[model samples]
Target: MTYNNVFDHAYEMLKENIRYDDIRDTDDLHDAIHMAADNAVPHYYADIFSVMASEGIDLEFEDSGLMPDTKDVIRILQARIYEQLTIDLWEDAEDLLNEYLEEVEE
Candidate 1:
């Protein structure tokens, strides 16, 4: 539950999309993140990708020249994650898409 310690939701975001079991360190995570971006495997789980990216847990995808909308979305998601983290209320913040949909349904 440490402020700088990334676990729970943040780790879950990475785990759900990648085979992260063999990730030995940040470098490995960086490699996997790069691969995901290169293979264009992120849209299907864009929410997870953006949040993880914002938390500094992802590779340098922004330098790869993504679309403007994609950059904006990632920027906004990063801000939201930062805000939520400050309040210790980021339990399910990684699932922003589903959470918003569930709220709309309610």
Candidate 2:
């Protein structure tokens, strides 16, 4: 058997969840995919991240081939999700923390 768009990966699984035996529209489809991705994140991508951070962007921009599918690449996609859903609290916290640190500085 030849491989040509034949693989059923995480996203395809997501695609199917809202396809048959159901009636949904664009809003529902959008909700469905985002919801599915949230579940997929921690269970699949945590390890891909553990290897990437170090030396302060020392890896530069061209270290290896990539996709944004497969376990390794998916984390890149998660960045879009991570920033919107969770990273904002970070901005608020850091804003508050830095104010305290700066005010207390001698």
Candidate 3:
């Protein structure tokens, strides 16, 4: 899907899944939100991206094709107004992604 469409889905998913009340820091928020976004990506891949591709859109990435950086996912979701911006959410997204990267050791 195009970034906007994927972003919209991510935002809705964020709203559906994220618990603003549960957040203590950015790390927590980031992980939760991105987990939602990641799920949303695959979920929408066929429904959204596939059709767009038929019409010609360069949204897909190499493997997954333009799978967002977790933070970018969060930013897109937040921009859609699905989630409000907070320091905790920001920190959580960054922290969790870093943790993930470290885990993957990439």
Candidate 4:
């Protein structure tokens, strides 16, 4: 799958906090996404869902598998970033993205 605009936004928000030798290509971007998702534990996903729900944001996932793969998590983050920006909640998005990075670093 290709990285969407949502992914691009998330990547930009995360770029300074995270490091990648060169996220200049799609494959490298994909790796960065996977790395971020890897740092999120099960509770992190739940927390994200709760935050979105409180804000009335509906994030949909195509995969219905009991266990989500890397793409699913990436998509989740992408959607959250996209929706947050769409609603003009830029600061909220920044906070959320930072929390995501903090979890990644922990």
Which stretches of model 3 miss by more than 4 angstroms? 43-106
lDDT of 4 at 47: 51
lDDT (Cα, tens digit) per residue for candidate 1, span 1-106: 2223433444445444443353334433444443333332223345545446554343333333332345565554444334333233223334432433355342
> Residue-wise lDDT of candidate 2 within 10-106, one digit each (tens)?
2444445544424233333445445544543433354334423322122222323332435645656444333332222222333333443455444
Q: lDDT of each model, Cα atoms only?
A: 0.39, 0.36, 0.43, 0.43
Top-scoring candidate (lDDT)? 3
Q: What ranking of all candidate models by TM-score puts the best one first? A: 3, 4, 2, 1
Q: Residue 47 in model 4: shift from native, Å?
A: 3.2
Clashes per candidate (backbone, < 3 Å): 0, 0, 10, 0
Candidate with maximal TM-score = 3
Better of 2 and 4 by lDDT: 4
Summing lDDT over every window of 10 consecutive residues in candidate 2, give the lowest-scoring window: 1-10
Model 3 Cα lDDT, one tens digit per residue, 1-106: 4545555555555554444444435544656675565654533324543434443234324233224356655433332322222222343464444444454342
TM-score (all chains, Cα) for each model: 0.23, 0.32, 0.36, 0.34
Name the better of 1 and 4 by TM-score: 4
Reference-based TM-score, model 1: 0.23
Q: After superposing candidate 2, which stretches have Cα over 4 Å from the reference?
A: 1-9, 20-24, 44-106
Residue clash pairs of candidate 1: none
**Ranked candidates, highest lDDT first:** 3, 4, 1, 2
